[PDB]
């Protein structure tokens, strides 16, 4: 029963159209509880999960402040970066930042993170030890030295190892009836036809939470997994997820096939026939 | 809770 807190920040440059965009979302596992959008109205850090609505003025006032700080630094990074690579002001670029923590079943610290991306690809990341930085190019080195002098690793690790897990635990308890819930997939299989020869088998996993799941095709112990079709686990819109897999076989060799549904809401990995 | 100490690249 592991859990985690993640914060995702996206900032996009608007060549000739004013200030860049700043979206900020905060999750607890596969559930979101906060957001900030420069484009929005309130212009404050807003709740997105009802159990976060219980924190007071002190919380939101602080969180709003820090996200505007995060925005401010990012606003700057876009210009800094553009300089680094000497790119033109005419085009738009993207910056993304992600940091958080993982706790085990004992709910204690377990992992800490902090990746930084530019134009869709790693720019700099904190190593697992939380004392070292990984740069992706000559530009990103400058950032590396710059940060190794300001003591980012020092402060972040304190955050990641301490306050991150302390607050994650607080949320978990508060979102008791929501975050600690584990929904089992309502599996079932369907059968469609292409011709007088090949049929298509599709396994369905529905209403499951968390998203962690591994649907599998199998032939009495073999790997019918090279030629099949997987779909990105998709949200249902109500806090649960959906996913499916399918294979082709001539209207026949269809009773010997197996679907291996793996999810933490299931004691034993499910198996099916039709 | 948000981290309180961002720094520029």
């Amino acid at each position, epitope marked *: 029963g592991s859990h985690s807190m993640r914060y995702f920040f996206t900032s996009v440059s608007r060549p000739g159209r004013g200030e860049p965009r700043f979206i900020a979302v905060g999750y607890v596992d596969d559930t979101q509880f906060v957001r900030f959008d420069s484009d929005a109205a309130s212009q404050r850090m807003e709740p997105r999960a009802p159990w976060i609505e219980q924190e007071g003025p002190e919380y939101w006032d*602080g969180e709003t402040r820090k996200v505007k700080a995060h925005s401010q630094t990012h606003r700057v990074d876009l210009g800094t970066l553009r300089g680094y690579y000497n790119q033109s002001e005419a085009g738009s670029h993207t910056v993304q930042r992600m940091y958080g923590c993982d706790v085990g079943s004992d709910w204690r610290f377990l992992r800490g993170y902090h990746q930084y991306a530019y134009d869709g690809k790693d720019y700099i990341a904190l190593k697992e030890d939380l004392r070292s930085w990984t740069a992706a190019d000559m530009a990103a080195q400058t950032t590396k030295h710059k940060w190794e002098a300001a003591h980012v690793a020092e402060q972040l690790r304190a955050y990641l*190892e301490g306050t991150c897990v302390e607050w994650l635990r607080r949320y978990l308890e508060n979102g008791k009836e929501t975050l600690q819930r584990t929904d089992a997939p309502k599996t079932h299989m369907t059968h469609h036809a292409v011709s007088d020869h090949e049929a298509t088998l599709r396994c369905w996993a529905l209403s499951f939470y968390p998203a962690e799941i591994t649907l599998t095709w199998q032939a009495d112990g073999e790997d019918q997994t090279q030629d099949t079709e997987l779909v990105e686990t998709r949200p249902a819109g109500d806090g649960t997820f959906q996913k499916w897999a399918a294979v082709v076989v001539p209207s026949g060799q269809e009773q010997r096939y197996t679907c291996h549904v793996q999810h933490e809401g299931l004691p034993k990995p499910l198996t099916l026939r039709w | 809770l948000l981290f*309180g100490y961002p720094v520029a690249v």
Partner: T-cell receptor, first 110, second 114 residues
Framework: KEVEQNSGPLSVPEGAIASLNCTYS??????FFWYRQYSGKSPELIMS????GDKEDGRFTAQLNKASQYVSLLIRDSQPSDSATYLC???????????FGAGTQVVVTP | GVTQTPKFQVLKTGQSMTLQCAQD?????MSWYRQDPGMGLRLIHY???????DQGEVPNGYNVSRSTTEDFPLRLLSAAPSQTSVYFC??????????????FGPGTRLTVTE
């Protein structure tokens, strides 16, 4: 309001231990400090704690309990020179307003 | 570090004066406080960067500017007997990075009189 340093008028003999307590109200606090202010002078930052636990570097020892939102500073080996008033500061972020306690006046009696 | 002048200053109700403050640490977040026996430290004004300035717990009686990132001049237009206190100017990195530690300046003492 926000931060409360236990007692204004205080005292302690030589070679002893001096315990200063501090209590803050914003659960979201993430950075805690201890300042020392000699009468007629400016507060000289003397201790910073970023994780809850025990930091004991020097003759000073700092404790942080986030669960109880409490901050400590125990001065092992009392010298009369330590005679000064100790200020306790706490904040949330790089943009949060530093918050001080009325300060607890300490007195090393020879 | 943080420097500020004058050290001591005596004044007459209605007189104008400007307390100087400087920091040689490339900090973005400078502040001004006044210390009184009954209240301890109390913020007057504060700035997080250049051209940025904002009210504090007691901004009545003080003005403040921030043209450069190294200086943060506190201004008393027309002095008042209640302005009598000790003024400490402090600075912080802010979004600049480094030790999230705030450092105080030596302070200035001011006694006003009708």
């Amino acid at each position: 309001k926000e931060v409360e340093q236990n007692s204004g008028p205080l005292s302690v003999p030589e070679g002893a231990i001096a315990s200063l307590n501090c209590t803050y109200s914003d659960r979201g606090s993430q950075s805690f400090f201890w300042y020392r202010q000699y009468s007629g002078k400016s507060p000289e930052l003397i201790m910073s704690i970023y994780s809850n636990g025990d930091k004991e570097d020097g003759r000073f020892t700092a404790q942080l309990n986030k669960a109880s939102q409490y901050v400590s500073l125990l001065i092992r080996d009392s010298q009369p020179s330590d005679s000064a008033t100790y200020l306790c500061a706490v904040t949330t972020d790089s943009w949060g307003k530093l918050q001080f306690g009325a300060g607890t006046q300490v007195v090393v009696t020879p | 570090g943080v420097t500020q002048t004058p050290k001591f200053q005596v004044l007459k109700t209605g007189q104008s004066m400007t307390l100087q403050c400087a920091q040689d640490m490339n900090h973005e977040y400078m502040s001004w406080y006044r210390q009184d026996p009954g209240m301890g430290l109390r913020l007057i004004h504060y700035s997080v960067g250049a051209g940025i300035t904002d009210q504090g717990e007691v901004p009545n009686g003080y003005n403040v500017s921030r043209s450069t990132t190294e200086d943060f001049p506190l201004r008393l237009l027309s002095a008042a007997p209640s302005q009598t206190s000790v003024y400490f100017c402090a600075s912080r990195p802010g979004l600049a990075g480094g030790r999230p530690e705030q450092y105080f300046g030596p302070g200035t003492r001011l006694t006003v009189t009708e």
